[PDB]
Write an enzyme that holds these catalytic residues in place. Structure first.
Site, PDB file in Angstrom:
ATOM      1  N   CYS A 136      84.637 -71.259  26.079  1.00 12.22           N
ATOM      2  CA  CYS A 136      85.840 -71.861  25.513  1.00 12.22           C
ATOM      3  C   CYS A 136      86.911 -72.126  26.569  1.00 12.22           C
ATOM      4  CB  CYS A 136      86.400 -70.964  24.408  1.00 12.22           C
ATOM      5  SG  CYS A 136      86.524 -69.221  24.862  1.00 12.22           S
ATOM      6  N   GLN A 163      94.459 -65.890  25.782  1.00 10.54           N
ATOM      7  CA  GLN A 163      93.362 -66.189  24.867  1.00 10.54           C
ATOM      8  C   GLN A 163      93.512 -65.561  23.484  1.00 10.54           C
ATOM      9  OE1 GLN A 163      89.408 -65.971  26.712  1.00 10.54           O
ATOM     10  NE2 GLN A 163      90.417 -65.956  28.717  1.00 10.54           N
ATOM     11  N   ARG A 269      93.850 -61.315  26.782  1.00  8.76           N
ATOM     12  CA  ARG A 269      93.875 -61.484  25.335  1.00  8.76           C
ATOM     13  C   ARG A 269      95.305 -61.352  24.819  1.00  8.76           C
ATOM     14  NH1 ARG A 269      89.552 -63.443  22.851  1.00  8.76           N
ATOM     15  NH2 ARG A 269      88.211 -61.715  23.547  1.00  8.76           N
ATOM     16  N   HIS A 276      93.546 -71.005  22.684  1.00  6.34           N
ATOM     17  CA  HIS A 276      93.655 -70.502  24.046  1.00  6.34           C
ATOM     18  C   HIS A 276      94.743 -71.257  24.801  1.00  6.34           C
ATOM     19  CE1 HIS A 276      90.450 -67.923  23.258  1.00  6.34           C
ATOM     20  NE2 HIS A 276      89.490 -68.426  24.011  1.00  6.34           N
TER      21      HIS A 276
END
Ligand SMILES: NC(=O)c1ccc[n+]([C@@H]2O[C@H](COP(=O)([O-])OP(=O)(O)OC[C@H]3O[C@@H](n4cnc5c(N)ncnc54)[C@H](OP(=O)(O)O)[C@@H]3O)[C@@H](O)[C@H]2O)c1
Ligand SMILES: NC(=O)c1ccc[n+]([C@@H]2O[C@H](COP(=O)([O-])OP(=O)(O)OC[C@H]3O[C@@H](n4cnc5c(N)ncnc54)[C@H](OP(=O)(O)O)[C@@H]3O)[C@@H](O)[C@H]2O)c1
Lengths: 371, 371
Positions: A136, A163, A269, A276
């Site tokens: 991704c 993300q 994260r 994202h």
């Protein structure tokens, strides 16, 4: 003569996004959908506007061998088990996969057709039957900055990512939401009181995040109200697997085998749902006027959206809140950094579930049908 | 006999953190604290464990000019109003300020004594009377990486930040919490149901963040469940004021007026309460082994915390959840990047209200008392 396409992992999250997109684009009109399962053999399949066969065994090689195409979002564990056994049985069909398992395989191509359509076409003529969706992070980055690489300007890139929880799974998204709810509930009364001390509120929130009762089963740590500077497995070089993929997958997509472009950074994260975000330090190999850079970026594909480097428009457009659920890939904050005229700063946002997962897969399916 | 110290802005958020720290370190034992107010003249001051006079007028030049030291967290509007009047009245006392107002003034020093104690000492000997706290982002970065700058190894630095709501204010922190609550409340029933669809939950959450009823008054946009890639006012060069402060304040702290170290990047607001996180790309001007770099970093000050580049410890230690409310400034993910051996990656987390605001101020006060 209509191709039989095997759908695996359709019931899962990424598969559900895939289903939604394929329904919207009427992809099922052009194929014969065969839905497979790893739990409910004989059960009812999803509605696609046409009569379909009952759910079939996703581990039955005899069933899979009859397929022309296999489109799977079931996961890397499934691919690792079934794919080699299927090929050994003499299956010569096309394998489209969301999982990372076959990405770096010599007989496979990482697909992102707005970026490497020519690579895909040449592979198809060469007889390649394996076409894998990219990570991704890499996909969303290239969808935003494809024009710079296409111009051969990029020397190296440092990518610091923001993300979303969706990259970790459905249960992680639910956990993020529960964590947000738990954080707010601890000071719900105080938030109604205007005279409540902010440091008292802050103290209670911090205790809540650290408390055992805080839902941290899937992340192993708080995400809501915090962040996690490590994604996926640790590698012996000090990189996480997520960070390792940045350089490996970028150069394979761009077919830079001889002289690979250095790509590195930190994968973090954050408490976003399914988008994202990436803050990028880009070294160009020469001094290019900023307006030309903006031109190269915006003209690469019709999905990238140049956001003017002004405050209120950046605040409104360049965010997960504005991008979520859409195929738009905005890139903004484009400017020359203080290090020099060859240093480009950039911030981009992209939906993890669409261009970062499902969309390249269904588009790869359509490409097969146009051949 | 004992120095009379004026406290302005003690009641606000930064001031409250300052008061609590001064209490813990027993700073009030060494001074005669004179508390001022802009709203409650003659009122009752905070509990500092000793008898204090009723609140004095913070706009009374007559009273202020009797003070040996003024320590203000009241704000830039107050400083811009009172400071010129006070100096004009012949006041030769010391001015300690949290506000950014006087930071770039030639007769003022940006204080961060674990990093620039020598600069402070020389300024004191030279007769300098103005000592200002640095921007939270810059102070937190230097507390972590002071060892590298001290060794003169930094060629330039790209800083991608993950900044908390506390930097914007108390009402912003409240808004962040309210946003988290609104996000969760929209799918509260669905989260309690294990059989609910994740895409239905995601759709409702995305809809909620976009709805008008979503509390976005102070941020101008959703923060909870998202992020905002712009902090503070827009500048003509394409930088935000926050991003501009990186190079400007870093070099002034280091007293590098000649050839400034290029510091740039993107300052991004994330859904954290009071901890700033920073992902850093550091260009070194020398080939230094990673272990030696770690030594320089960790040996600089007793508050920096070198976190080993391993997954479990990074997830546990290198987060806002772990750092919040502490004087610890962990830095991790330390490794050479793919671009070259002189490129260093680093991730650091620090509390915005402590080392990023209140702590350098009370420490500067202590320095004055030790004269
Ligand atoms: O992440 P990701 O989207 O890439 O993959 P994912 O959603 O983690 O995939 C989960 C897989 O496990 C099965 N499964 C088990 N419980 C499920 C549930 N409650 N809802 C849907 N599928 C479930 C599905 O396979 P089957 O539907 O074949 O059992 C699905 O392919
Ligand atoms: C950085 O750090 C500095 C500190 O900012 P900050 O965020 O600490 O300022 P803040 O929390 O907004 O407080 C600033 C001042 O506003 C007054 N105030 C009005 N209503 C208040 C309330 N309900 N609670 C507390 N104080 C109230 C207080 O002064 P009085 O006590 O004089 O009313 C306080 O000193 C800023 O200058 C920024 O540049």
């Amino acid at each position: 003569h209509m191709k039989r396409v095997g759908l695996i992992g359709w019931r899962g999250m990424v598969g559900s996004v895939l289903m939604q997109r394929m329904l919207e684009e009427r992809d099922f009109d052009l194929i014969e959908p065969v839905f497979f399962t790893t739990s409910n053999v004989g059960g009812q399949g999803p509605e696609v506007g046409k009569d379909i066969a009952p759910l079939k065994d996703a581990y039955s090689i005899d069933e899979l061998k009859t397929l022309d195409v296999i489109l799977t979002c079931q996961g890397g564990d499934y691919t690792s088990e079934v794919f080699p056994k299927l090929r050994e049985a003499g299956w010569q069909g096309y394998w489209i996969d969301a999982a990372s398992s076959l990405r770096m395989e010599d007989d496979a191509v990482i697909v992102l057709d707005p970026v490497n359509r020519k690579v895909i076409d040449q592979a198809l003529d060469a007889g390649t039957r394996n076409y894998i969706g990219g990570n991704c992070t890499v996909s969303l980055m290239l969808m935003a900055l494809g024009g710079l690489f296409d111009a051969g300007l990029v020397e190296w890139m440092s990518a610091m990512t923001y993300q979303a929880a969706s990259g970790a799974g459905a249960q992680n998204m639910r956990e993020l939401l529960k964590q947000m709810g738990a954080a707010h509930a601890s000071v719900a009364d105080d938030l109604a009181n205007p005279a409540s001390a902010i440091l008292d509120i802050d103290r209670k929130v911090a205790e809540t995040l650290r408390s055992e009762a805080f839902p941290t089963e899937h992340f192993g740590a708080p995400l809501g109200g915090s962040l996690i500077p490590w994604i996926d497995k640790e590698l012996p070089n000090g990189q996480s697997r997520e960070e390792w993929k940045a350089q490996a997958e970028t150069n394979k997509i761009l077919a830079r085998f001889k002289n690979p472009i250095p790509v590195d950074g930190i994968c973090v994260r954050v408490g976003a749902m399914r988008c994202h975000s990436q803050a990028l330090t880009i070294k160009l190999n020469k001094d290019v006027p900023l307006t030309d850079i903006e031109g190269l970026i915006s003209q690469h594909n019709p999905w990238v959206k140049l956001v003017p480097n002004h405050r209120e428009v950046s605040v409104r457009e360049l965010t997960p809140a504005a991008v979520t659920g859409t195929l738009s890939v905005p890139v903004g904050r484009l400017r020359k950094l203080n290090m020099g005229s060859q240093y480009l700063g950039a911030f981009t946002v992209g939906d993890q579930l669409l261009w970062g997962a499902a969309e390249p897969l269904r588009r790869m399916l359509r490409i097969l049908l146009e051949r």
